[PDB]
Amino acid sequence: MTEYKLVVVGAGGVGKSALTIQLIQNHFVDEYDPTIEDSYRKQVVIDGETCLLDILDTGGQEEYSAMRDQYMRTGEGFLCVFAINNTKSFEDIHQYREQIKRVKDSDDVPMVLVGNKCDLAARTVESRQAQDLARSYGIPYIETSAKTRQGVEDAFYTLVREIRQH
């Protein structure tokens, strides 16, 4: 079956890790272990088609800036994430998109803009704002609340659809 290599990029502190976890992980088990073999892979059915999602989340390694290009190139599709209560992370979205476009050497790379709700702090990036940015880039925008599980599947599946329809 088809295997999609999804990469999750973005500034640190925006929950990128909660997204990947909230997708993969079994939500009815006390313990979760990342170091465990293939806890990054998951088989899912999308629009009746079964495939394998291989997700690359390098949360915590943001400071290793020189390894960005390597990690990104291994990907077919990208999830550009920013926290809705963190304006700086939002503004960083552009550079990430440019960096992806560069290593992939294409102006048309499958990607989704994801606004993520990490906590209850005041929202600082208004839905419309991201909406408009996502449209200017011509890519879908999905808002999520990784902790309440809302939007996570949509975010990932939407991207897979992008890859397929590329």
Add this chain to the structure above:
Amino acid sequence: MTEYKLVVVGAGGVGKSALTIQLIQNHFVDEYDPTIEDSYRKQVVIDGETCLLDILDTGGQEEYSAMRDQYMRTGEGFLCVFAINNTKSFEDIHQYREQIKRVKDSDDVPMVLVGNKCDLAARTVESRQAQDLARSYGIPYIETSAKTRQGVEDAFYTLVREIRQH
């Protein structure tokens, strides 16, 4: 990689800790801080096989017979140590050998006899004497010096070798 639980026993002051720390960090602890119970770990390749050593350094001759029994239940191999410049320590060895034998209930528990502090001139125990006692138990005897590093690797790795062939 295989895991080997080694236990270091013997009368206080003999060098148990000093030996382990030398093995572990290649550093000689000059001051004397009584040990209650600590635990070390070491990934090392012995005879082309990668092991993971769990060294349990115990407190010696402190007269806490109750606890000593607890240390020996887990251990797979024992490094019985005495200082070549302390006869009493040498005389205590049988007591430890007997106890291990008792606790584990076996007559061939992997173990090595170590005459530590062989960098000191004032020797009061002769190698022959120790060698004989070793032969009586059917175990090897190694003279070591946590201070210069002499025979430390040999002491520990030999023990690994015996747990390995047992």
Add this chain to the structure above:
Amino acid sequence: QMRLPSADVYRFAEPDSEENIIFEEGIPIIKAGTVIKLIERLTYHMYADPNFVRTFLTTYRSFCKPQELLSLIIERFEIPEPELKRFRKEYIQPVQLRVLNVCRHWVEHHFYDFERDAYLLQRMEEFIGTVRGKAMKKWVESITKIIQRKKIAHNITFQSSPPTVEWHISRPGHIETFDLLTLHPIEIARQLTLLESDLYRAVQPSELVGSVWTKEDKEINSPNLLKMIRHTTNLTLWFEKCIVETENLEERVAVVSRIIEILQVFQELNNFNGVLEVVSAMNSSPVYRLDHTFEQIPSRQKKILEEAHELSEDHYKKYLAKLRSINPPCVPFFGIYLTNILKTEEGNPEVLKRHGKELINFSKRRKVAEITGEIQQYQNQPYCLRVESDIKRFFENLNPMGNSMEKEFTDYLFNKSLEIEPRNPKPLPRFPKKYSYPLKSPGVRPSN
């Protein structure tokens, strides 16, 4: 059967129940429990488990304050007697010794708790000072000397002798001529391995537990980890600069080769960090596209660089396997750890509830402890390589980006790439040489 004090005069006597302690399905492994139940096992009388002490003292702060920990271990120490010689031998003694073990460790390896809170130290000193009994005397005096030692303010013995420092074009004391090609690739790798090995060894658990290096005061709480990652990033960037600033194809090919040799020596030294610094450079946008340059790289080297690159493939599958097999010393790649620690903390609940009773989720803390413990294990073994002050100084002061912001510099390098090897169909221009010395490598075999 041994009788315990009355759970009314000693809190740590409460029998275990599904309502205050849970075990993982050979001593027991605690899945979850109440702070009390935890500290009870922290100093259990039945068996020994120094791993639990390190684990607990490394992660307790997330579920118990320092001041509270003290108050609790103290309560644990003061056990009421109800055979008396049996209870003392099999209960009070082990327990009390173990409480003193925790105090010794706490002060010896997590002293920062007292540095940041003077009243805690005061209470600790006062407590240790009240431990009466000729028995405990041995330890009491020890914990005391350690405390005093810690308030006012490491030799290395080797099996063999360190190899001879290797030189090439640059000669001792001529730091002004030191550069990628004039120094000996063997020493370059050697010096950078020591440097990187020290940087690695200096990272403490407190800079890792709690994902603090990713928070806003990361500069204050994870200075050593950051200092380490930054060296790595610089080094990688330097390699990239060296390559795209050598415009002459023939000289550039010479550079990439040297770098691949350095990588080879890193492999030999088990400095996986260095391995990746190289791989990352080669895979960077600027370098990755220089087809004409890699075209001319001998096949043995292309194979080396490919095997090195495979380590990171499939989520470091091969990297992880190789570290688990090699024989230390080695410099691991820290990145892997950072991700697992972070993910372990985010993907697991701080507590598990059983009958409305929030029990501290200890398996979460144990998992993170396993990671910090793994880090520490590789931190012990020191390399047996003589230091070269001047070369050392040379790499310590490398500053690829100068005063340029990351993005500017980053674009610079990429443009440089487009200049020395234009996108097709544009034609490949020729450029003047820049090195006035021989470009032949001295090879990576140590001279003996």
